[PDB]
Every structure is written in structure tokens, then in C-alpha cells.
Amino acid sequence: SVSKANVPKIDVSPLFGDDQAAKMRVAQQIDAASRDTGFFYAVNHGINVQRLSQKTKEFHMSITPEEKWDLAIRAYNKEHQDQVRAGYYLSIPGKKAVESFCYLNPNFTPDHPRIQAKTPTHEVNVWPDETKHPGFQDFAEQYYWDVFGLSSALLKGYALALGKEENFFARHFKPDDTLASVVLIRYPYLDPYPEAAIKTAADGTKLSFEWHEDVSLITVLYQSNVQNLQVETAAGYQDIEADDTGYLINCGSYMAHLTNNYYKAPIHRVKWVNAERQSLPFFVNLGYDSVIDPFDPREPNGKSDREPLSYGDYLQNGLVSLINKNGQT
Ligand SMILES: CC(C)[C@@H](OC(=O)[C@@H](NC(=O)CCC[C@H](N)C(=O)O)C(=O)S)C(=O)O
Ligand SMILES: [Fe+2]
DSSP: OOOBOOOOEEEOGGGGSSOHHHHHHHHHHHHHHHHTTSEEEEESOOOOHHHHHHHHHHHHHHOOHHHHHHHBOTTTOTTOTTOSSSEEEOOBTTTBOOEEEEEOOTTOOTTSHHHHTTOTTOOOOOOOOTTTSTTHHHHHHHHHHHHHHHHHHHHHHHHHHTTSOTTTTGGGOOTTTOOOEEEEEEEOOOSSOOGGGOEEOTTSOEEEEEEEOOSSSEEEEEEOSSOOEEEEETTEEEEOOOOTTSEEEEEOHHHHHHTTTSSOOOOEEEEOOOSOEEEEEEEEOOOTTOOOOOOOTTSTTOOOSOOOOOHHHHHHHHHHHHHHHHOOO
8 A cells, every 4th residue: 555656767868968958958857856756766877787786796695704704894893993984784693684885985095185184984995805806896996986977967967956057066076085985785585584683664664774864965876676665755655666777866965955955855764675685875975075055946045044064074973873863784
């Protein structure tokens, strides 16, 4: 008795080119979806998602328990105090089913100025041994740049949709300092599936992850073809159809702040499904010092009564708050 959510498929290919009128017609579709359910599928995006899924599968099914401890974030391994964001997030058999691997900007090297200053939210990525996972690091770093390029084009569409010049968001989204992350999430098939790893919503729906708003400017997600996401609308939680050929896009709470809730961060949750599947989000984050002055496209003078918030302040506070609300992933 759950209605299907309206999640339009938008051909975003004009956002990579120079046909300005064509780009405005894409921007209108982004505006409409952002004002409706808050979700859309970006199609004709140019990324080889089948290869992404194959390379990610090869990694998840070959990594060993030894490697997981050696790559583990601080929540699982006290020896790794510098790893708050980047590294392996272990499962706990009988208690926690999901496991994942997160990496950040490949330009965050030991010599990067923010790494030298030990600025919060910046970390040097950790990678498994090359002989054990041949080609993985190179593939994953190239994927970061492929999805960064898609995300820059999507940000041009959001800017045009809000009545701004196309580089309004994209000028703060740069290869040398973006705080964007990739997460390679594995949701396992388990027989028997631990009840401790299943949450229950107030409406009785079985979930893997509770309701939340994303901590991002926008979220650019690839998932296997297994339906699982739900979005809260006025008519209740609705099912978001799977589409393993497109990227599912939504706004995060930084976009809601900047637009004075004109483009809301949709509240959504992840249903429990007993299936072996992948979920590969790219969280589009700006730079640490990036500050966009808030505005309101519903008001004639475009002024907002919100205070400017630096992206760095937003992000570190948001990641902690999400772990406190919905648990350590
Ligand atoms: C989006 C997908 C639905 C997926 O969910 C996420 O990745 C979950 N994000 C976070 O935990 C924030 C992870 C932040 C990451 N460590 C970082 O440092 O930048 C959300 O549900 S959003 C899933 O479960 O399939
Ligand atoms: Fe989310």
C-alpha cells in the first residue's frame, strides 16, 4: 500500500555543452523535481556505471578480515586516530549487516596544505595492498574524477534553476580542495538475517537506515537494481524506483540552507531488503572555507534571514550529528 514517488528521468547531457537554451530547459526540470519530491534520476550522464559496479564487486568480495582491520576507521580501530572519515567501516556479524569503504579527494596528499595544518574533515586516503587488489586504487581515484565531472555539470543546472549564473556553486567545487567523498557500500544477503541489524520505523516498515536529511550540497548516487529507498512526501513515505543505469540525485541540507528551504533536503530512509547489493554515493561537498551567502528565490529582493555558514563548519558538525542520530555506519 505504498505509492511510487515521482522521480523523473532528466537527460543532463546538455549541461556538459554550450547550448545555453538547452541548458535552461534542463535547469527547469531540475527546478521542478527539486520543488516536488526532491529526487530525480540523471540519465545520459556519460559514466560507465556497469564497470564501476564490476570493479566495486571485485573489491568487496575479495577484501579479507585482516585487510578490514588494517584499513579500519577509528570507530573500529583505536590505532587509527587520524581516520575519522576515510577507510573501512566494518560489519558486525549478528548485529550490523552493512559494511563500506570511504575515500576522499585524491589530492589530499601528505604535502597538501590542509593535511599539513591538520584541518578537520581532511584526511589522506588509505588503500589496500596493490598486489592483493590490482588496479583498484587507480580505478577508484579515476571514478572520483569522473563523478566530480558529472557533479560539476549538475551544479551548473542547479545554479541556472535558481536564477543564478552557471558557475554559482561550481566555482566553490574545485579539484584542489573539495571535501566530497565516495562511499562503496556493501549490503549483504544473509540467511538468517540478524534481527539486531534491522530497524523498525514508526509505521512498521523494516529499515536498514532511519529517516534523515543528507549532509551535502547535493548527493549523486549509483545503486544496484534492487528497490530500497523511500522519500517522505505530503502523502506519506513513497517508494523511489530503482534505476541502475542512472544516478539518483537529491539535495542535502546545505542546499536547503542556501535557498531558504526553496529546495528542501528531502527526508528519506533505506528499507531493509535481504539482498546482496551495492550503494555508491558521492557526497558533493564544497571546500572548507567555502561560504555562499544565503538567498531566497521566492522573495522579490531575494534576501534571506539566514546567516552565512562555512561549508567546513557545516560538514564537521553534520557528520557527527548524523552518527549520533542514526548510528555509526
Ligand atoms: C546514500 C546511500 C543511501 C547510502 O547511505 C549513506 O551513505 C548514508 N550516509 C552517511 O552515512 C554519511 C557518510 C559520510 C561519509 N563517511 C563521509 O565522511 O563523507 C545516508 O543514508 S545519506 C546507503 O546506506 O545506501
Ligand atoms: Fe541519504
